[PDB]
Design an enzyme around this catalytic site. Structure first.
Site, PDB file in Angstrom:
ATOM      1  N   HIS A  32       0.746  -1.189  -0.044  1.00 38.17           N
ATOM      2  CA  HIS A  32      -0.169  -0.047  -0.048  1.00 38.17           C
ATOM      3  C   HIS A  32       0.809   1.135   0.185  1.00 38.17           C
ATOM      4  O   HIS A  32       0.325   2.402   0.373  1.00 38.17           O
ATOM      5  CB  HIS A  32      -1.063   0.024   1.197  1.00 38.17           C
ATOM      6  CG  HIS A  32      -0.849  -0.684   2.530  1.00 38.17           C
ATOM      7  ND1 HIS A  32      -0.414  -0.070   3.368  1.00 38.17           N
ATOM      8  CD2 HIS A  32      -0.848  -1.990   2.592  1.00 38.17           C
ATOM      9  CE1 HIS A  32      -0.205  -0.939   4.316  1.00 38.17           C
ATOM     10  NE2 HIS A  32      -0.803  -2.167   3.916  1.00 38.17           N
ATOM     11  N   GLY A  90       2.756   6.225   9.641  1.00 35.84           N
ATOM     12  CA  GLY A  90       4.212   6.008   9.146  1.00 35.84           C
ATOM     13  C   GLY A  90       4.826   4.952   9.804  1.00 35.84           C
ATOM     14  O   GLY A  90       5.985   4.740   9.352  1.00 35.84           O
ATOM     15  N   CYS A  97       4.146   1.634   9.150  1.00 36.85           N
ATOM     16  CA  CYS A  97       3.913   0.672   8.358  1.00 36.85           C
ATOM     17  C   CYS A  97       5.319   0.180   7.789  1.00 36.85           C
ATOM     18  O   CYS A  97       5.994   1.081   7.337  1.00 36.85           O
ATOM     19  CB  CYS A  97       2.724   0.633   7.255  1.00 36.85           C
ATOM     20  SG  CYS A  97       1.238   1.051   7.912  1.00 36.85           S
TER      21      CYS A  97
HETATM   22  C1  LIG Z   1       0.594   2.815   8.098  1.00 34.82           C
HETATM   23  O1  LIG Z   1       1.904   3.368   8.579  1.00 34.82           O
HETATM   24  C2  LIG Z   1       0.307   3.300   6.486  1.00 34.82           C
HETATM   25  N1  LIG Z   1       0.134   4.756   6.386  1.00 34.82           N
HETATM   26  C3  LIG Z   1      -0.268   5.077   5.308  1.00 34.82           C
HETATM   27  C4  LIG Z   1      -0.811   6.357   4.619  1.00 34.82           C
HETATM   28  C5  LIG Z   1      -0.943   6.465   3.358  1.00 34.82           C
HETATM   29  C6  LIG Z   1      -0.890   5.337   2.587  1.00 34.82           C
HETATM   30  C7  LIG Z   1      -0.329   4.207   2.828  1.00 34.82           C
HETATM   31  C8  LIG Z   1      -0.199   3.802   4.148  1.00 34.82           C
HETATM   32  S1  LIG Z   1       0.205   2.537   5.259  1.00 34.82           S
HETATM   33  C9  LIG Z   1      -0.678   3.157   8.878  1.00 34.82           C
HETATM   34  C10 LIG Z   1      -0.321   2.515  10.350  1.00 34.82           C
HETATM   35  C11 LIG Z   1      -1.523   2.930  11.179  1.00 34.82           C
HETATM   36  C12 LIG Z   1      -2.127   4.151  11.407  1.00 34.82           C
HETATM   37  C13 LIG Z   1      -2.662   4.261  12.856  1.00 34.82           C
HETATM   38  N2  LIG Z   1      -1.821   3.449  13.489  1.00 34.82           N
HETATM   39  C14 LIG Z   1      -1.426   2.506  12.554  1.00 34.82           C
HETATM   40  O2  LIG Z   1      -1.044   1.267  12.686  1.00 34.82           O
HETATM   41  N3  LIG Z   1      -1.767   2.226   8.536  1.00 34.82           N
HETATM   42  C15 LIG Z   1      -2.981   2.853   8.225  1.00 34.82           C
HETATM   43  O3  LIG Z   1      -3.231   3.744   8.503  1.00 34.82           O
HETATM   44  C16 LIG Z   1      -3.794   1.831   7.339  1.00 34.82           C
HETATM   45  C17 LIG Z   1      -3.509   1.606   5.834  1.00 34.82           C
HETATM   46  C18 LIG Z   1      -4.725   2.052   5.083  1.00 34.82           C
HETATM   47  C19 LIG Z   1      -5.887   2.435   6.273  1.00 34.82           C
HETATM   48  N4  LIG Z   1      -5.121   2.306   7.836  1.00 34.82           N
HETATM   49  C20 LIG Z   1      -6.111   1.801   8.824  1.00 34.82           C
HETATM   50  O4  LIG Z   1      -5.040   1.324   9.821  1.00 34.82           O
HETATM   51  C21 LIG Z   1      -7.000   2.199   9.053  1.00 34.82           C
HETATM   52  N5  LIG Z   1      -7.847   1.305  10.171  1.00 34.82           N
HETATM   53  S2  LIG Z   1      -8.774  -0.061   9.256  1.00 34.82           S
HETATM   54  C22 LIG Z   1      -7.656  -1.568   9.695  1.00 34.82           C
HETATM   55  O5  LIG Z   1      -8.754   0.036   7.823  1.00 34.82           O
HETATM   56  O6  LIG Z   1     -10.145  -0.133  10.123  1.00 34.82           O
HETATM   57  C23 LIG Z   1      -7.034   3.698   9.567  1.00 34.82           C
HETATM   58  C24 LIG Z   1      -6.077   3.897  10.931  1.00 34.82           C
HETATM   59  C25 LIG Z   1      -8.382   4.123  10.106  1.00 34.82           C
HETATM   60  C26 LIG Z   1      -4.328   0.576   5.167  1.00 34.82           C
HETATM   61  C27 LIG Z   1      -4.788  -0.583   5.553  1.00 34.82           C
HETATM   62  C28 LIG Z   1      -3.783   0.459   3.572  1.00 34.82           C
END
Ligand SMILES: *[C@@](O)(c1nc2ccccc2s1)[C@H](C[C@@H]1CCNC1=O)NC(=O)[C@@H]1[C@@H]2[C@H](CN1C(=O)[C@@H](NS(C)(=O)=O)C(C)C)C2(C)C
Ligand SMILES: *[C@@](O)(c1nc2ccccc2s1)[C@H](C[C@@H]1CCNC1=O)NC(=O)[C@@H]1[C@@H]2[C@H](CN1C(=O)[C@@H](NS(C)(=O)=O)C(C)C)C2(C)C
Lengths: 299, 299
Positions: free
Chosen positions: B40, B142, B144
């Site tokens: 992603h 950030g 991830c």
């Molecule tokens: C991860 O660091 C990412 N951030 C981004 C930003 C833009 C594009 C791609 C990514 S990957 C981030 C880490 C999480 C944020 C909150 N704490 C964390 O551990 N992952 C995410 O934000 C993931 C990411 C998109 C949406 N997201 C979520 O976790 C959402 N929750 S959910 C599981 O979909 O219910 C969001 C926090 C509401 C994907 C899944 C690609």
């Protein structure tokens, strides 16, 4: 989320050597061309009841010291004795010596400990310097010489060097200049530490971190003055809150919109009435091992 | 003493790069000449509701990927897509690549997580793979791409790569082959995880570690069969104990002289009657984040 974390131990692993003096084997810190280690490496398991480290250090020559950086022997060319630590000057300087400094943390300050055995890093965990100058860590035989550290981006601040395990189950050591943290001495004797208080500021910063993470059931509609709460906490063996601690809680009070004295009121009723089965941040106890800076670092 | 510890993160810091695809910036693992990262990275904050990662990967060429090892740009020469992870082949091979392997841990197995942000290691903590395939860790935006790892002396076993934070507050990711741990998918949707059970074996190994450390008030003069206790625990949402787990508890049962079924009896009355204010190892809860191997490692 909210976990107990330690600073990345990488830079410290590069300074972890194995020092030996006869039968005795304990860890050492190799910074530049000097190897810092506990002075009780010159002791036998029978020269511990009360050893005169001055006379013991007489007979011990440079060749009585075996410094082994991994599988490579360094040459002890000189040997000093600052307070409770040895300082063996070696030929080679550490090519992996990072930007470092030697600091003395205060009661309440937390640091990461890289627990080493026979010169090998065994693992890392985070502890605070308890107000009674002891640490509730995890040490076995041969752990002496393992260091405590914080990191300032580039700069590794050294603040602890392990020496012994006190009767009560907790540990005690020195700073990197050899001075013991607390009223302890490096001898095998029944020297128990005093009564332990709770770092009030560290619990308030934990409840602030808890609010930021969603757990906020403990929050009450009340307030209290710093004089009022501080006198209530003092009865429960709690570190007296000062106006300084209140200011340090600043950024957390700003992030949460909760006044420091509003937070002291929720804690006041939590002390008086207990947690009654419920959990804050998945803990059934009031956790004081996190400083306000520890909490900000995870935000 | 008995602390929650993580493996020394050193070797993993050497494989921590910053990957970027347009606006998006997330961490990557540089092993040999390959950089593993969550797929992603090719997404925008509006291409997350449900993105077809196949069509999104079409327009993205090697030059749309900015791999920056510290301050040094690597050249993406090829790009693959194994399950939910990207695999960008780079020109230089990592001179710091350690002896490594890619593993898939099972529910109950614990590993250290080196939480990274913008390619920089922020800190390390230990978590278990909860039976519902989620982790109770500490991640912000950030994070991830941060990896989970165990160490076999020389060999660093990789077992996790962070992807998202589930509604319930807990986190979920993949192994290093891109397969999600659990029924999760990499999209922004309300996909809550099931009910969580307690790793029974991990609590028994914690009570064994507690006995080894001096806290032993919870110990009763009773016993129970594996059929008897297992059926009692099942009601309290506990992982059914198998004869395998009993054998794994072997060395602890040997160190302590306490039969596994004698230990299940003390736990049985602890579940029925509660801890009633008292603390085991300084915890007012029954802790299941420590495997039998974690406990042996600290002895
Ligand atoms: C991860 O660091 C990412 N951030 C981004 C930003 C833009 C594009 C791609 C990514 S990957 C981030 C880490 C999480 C944020 C909150 N704490 C964390 O551990 N992952 C995410 O934000 C993931 C990411 C998109 C949406 N997201 C979520 O976790 C959402 N929750 S959910 C599981 O979909 O219910 C969001 C926090 C509401 C994907 C899944 C690609
Ligand atoms: C440390 O690793 C050392 N071991 C030896 C062995 C021979 C010579 C010198 C040293 S330093 C070791 C670590 C502790 C063991 C238990 N867990 C630990 O953290 N330190 C000690 O054993 C120190 C050491 C001598 C005695 N000792 C103690 O802690 C004793 N407790 S006490 C504080 O004296 O009440 C012992 C565990 C009963 C000194 C103080 C030099």
């Amino acid at each position: 989320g909210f976990r107990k974390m330690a600073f990345p131990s990488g830079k410290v692993e590069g300074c972890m050597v194995q020092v030996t003096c006869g039968t005795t084997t304990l860890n050492g810190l190799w910074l530049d061309d000097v190897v810092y280690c506990p002075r009780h490496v010159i002791c036998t398991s029978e020269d511990m009841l009360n050893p005169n480290y001055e006379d013991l250090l007489i007979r011990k020559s440079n060749h009585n010291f075996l410094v082994q950086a991994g599988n490579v022997q360094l040459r002890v060319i000189g040997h000093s004795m600052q307070n409770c630590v040895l300082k063996l000057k070696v030929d080679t300087a550490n090519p992996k010596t990072p930007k470092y400094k030697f600091v003395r943390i205060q009661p309440g300050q937390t640091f990461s400990v890289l627990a080493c055995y026979n010169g090998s890093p065994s693992g890392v965990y985070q502890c605070a310097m308890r107000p009674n100058f002891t640490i509730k860590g995890s040490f076995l035989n041969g752990s002496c010489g393992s260091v405590g550290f914080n990191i300032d981006y580039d700069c590794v601040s050294f603040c602890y060097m392990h020496h012994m395990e006190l009767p009560t189950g907790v540990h005690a050591g020195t700073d990197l200049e050899g001075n013991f943290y607390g009223p302890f001495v490096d001898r095998q004797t029944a020297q128990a530490a005093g009564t332990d208080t709770t770092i009030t500021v560290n619990v308030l910063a934990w409840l602030y971190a808890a609010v930021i993470n969603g757990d906020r059931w403990f929050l009450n509609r009340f307030t209290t003055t710093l004089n009022d709460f501080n006198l209530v906490a003092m009865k429960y063996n709690y570190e007296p809150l000062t106006q300084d601690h209140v200011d340090i809680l600043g950024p957390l009070s700003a992030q949460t919109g909760i006044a420091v004295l509003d937070m002291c009121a929720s804690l006041k009723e939590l002390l008086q009435n207990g947690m009654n089965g419920r959990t804050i941040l998945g803990s059934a106890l009031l956790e004081d091992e996190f400083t306000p800076f520890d909490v900000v670092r995870q935000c």
